[PDB]
Amino acid sequence: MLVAYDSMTGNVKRFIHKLNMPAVQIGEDLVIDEDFILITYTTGFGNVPERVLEFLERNNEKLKGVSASGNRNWGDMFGASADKISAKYEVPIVSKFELSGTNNDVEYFKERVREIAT
Template identity: 50%
Template sequence: MNEVVKLLIIYDSLTGNIQRFINKLDMRSTKITTELSINEPFVLITYSTGYGEVPKSIEKFLESNHQYLKGVMGSGNRNWGKFYCGAAEIISKRYDVPLLHKFELSGNAYDIEKIKMEVLNIV
């Protein structure tokens, strides 16, 4: 098993775009639930709500798990202009972790390879 597969990807998906993206990755992943507690390094993939805001489920999860956060990625729609992937930008600044990548909707082959390379660089 290579290092990319070992690092955990934590995500939440409102419209299904991130879930479809996760299904394309060959990486360990877990969807956020109210009971989820992590005790290992992870990378977060998030969507944005409203005008580039962090979803409540992500905020609540990070309140008690942010110490293991190693990087963040965002999924969004470029039609939102300056608010595109705003949640990922906020999380990156708030927790002082790298913003690894932004991708549109459920991503494409380039996004998958880009994320695997970024995650490998963290390990």
Template identity: 45%
Template sequence: MIYLYYDSRTGNVERFINKVIQITGWTAVRIQEDTIITEPGHLVTYTTNFGKVPDKTESFANKFAEILYSVTASGNRNWGRNYAIAAEKISDHYAIPLAMKFELSGTLEDINQFIDIIKNQHYDSKRGSEKLDIA
């Protein structure tokens, strides 16, 4: 079973996650302040304030980085070099492989790419796999 842990403020990430689970049947858990996880999984979040990691996401990553296989973030290309940069910041700070970035709630192509990355390039591999770092 593949677990996705996500944070969404405007609904973009939640829409992306809902499409992914409709296709795959994977388990998704929305991050709350008191969320506790025991199963390894993949983090999907958003970027806020033109390049900041959301506080709830930061706290979650700080607690559970050791069992997060990858990080993916939503962003807005209008932010230029800060586009979905939360994924890069989390990846760098916690040594979690960067899976991908997508704009807003993602396109069908983004969703399929995410599924492919998680299922075929990561599944059953070790957390530190360099192969996953394709974003």
């Protein structure tokens, strides 16, 4: 499955490169015409980044699941971008991981996406 992602300081980008799955960085101009999983980071106080919000305003039809990178210092706001997107668009939260993730976070994401893709 295609992974769409956004990264501001490189942590989600690093995670993407550990997955070895088809992936595309989201942009203002991007239209995704096939099923995809979104990986986002969390910004502000528990929020979805603006670039991800504007992309999802336009591309949510094919969204099948969302993961968030985040930081457990944020307590109940940890990965809350994924909670928001999941609730709004009624798609599963695939996973939450800290920063660029661990090897287990990588395998877990892949195994959960293989499930959702069936």
